[PDB]
Amino acid sequence: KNSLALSLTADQMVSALLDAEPPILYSEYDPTRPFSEASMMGLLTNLADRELVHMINWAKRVPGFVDLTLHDQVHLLECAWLEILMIGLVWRSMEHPGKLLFAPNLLLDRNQGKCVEGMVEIFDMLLATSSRFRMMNLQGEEFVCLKSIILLNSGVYTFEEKDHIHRVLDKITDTLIHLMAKAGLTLQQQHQRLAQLLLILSHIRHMSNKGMEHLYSMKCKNVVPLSDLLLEMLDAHR
């Protein structure tokens, strides 16, 4: 029952995660810039459903994730999928201060989030995470590590299969420290930056919980059509 993820070096771990990165998708190209409440949520939930398909292919390409059982893989994705979508959104929005890059052709500021009630709250939390990632000078190699950590950790306490996940989590921790020491950070800066990055994941969890509740109320409004896959990921939180 041994896995090949624990034998990879820190450099081999960085390369495997980078080559597994999902593509950047687009939204509908209708030039009607004034959005209605249903128009914006329709474009966002359509993009989330399409990005979710690539996330599942990214998950299988995460070192160690293929070694879990089918049911363990389902549990990890079911609880972490919104966090992974959010940290991916926050990462693309780094070089766009005050704006969220949902897609290259769908860049939105916080004033446009007022079109949907309850969305401006989550909007501000996402913008705040980009500012932190921007002011921390978050690198792409650190980002792919934080996203895999979310996948493996978010549902690990809701299950020796748990030991395998904790061994891969320790592997990514070695990979993160290896990246920081490679950049010239001292020993004190390594564990400090390690702590600062991991504490942001606690807030990404908070945005997911606030956003998962907001997605449940729109199912109860039945105004913006949600895909069956998005509904099954949403039902897993109740």
Binding site: V53, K60, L70, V74
Partner: peptide, 11 residues
Amino acid sequence: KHKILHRLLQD
């Protein structure tokens, strides 16, 4: 149970 997630993970 029948889940779309099961099919997407197996393919």
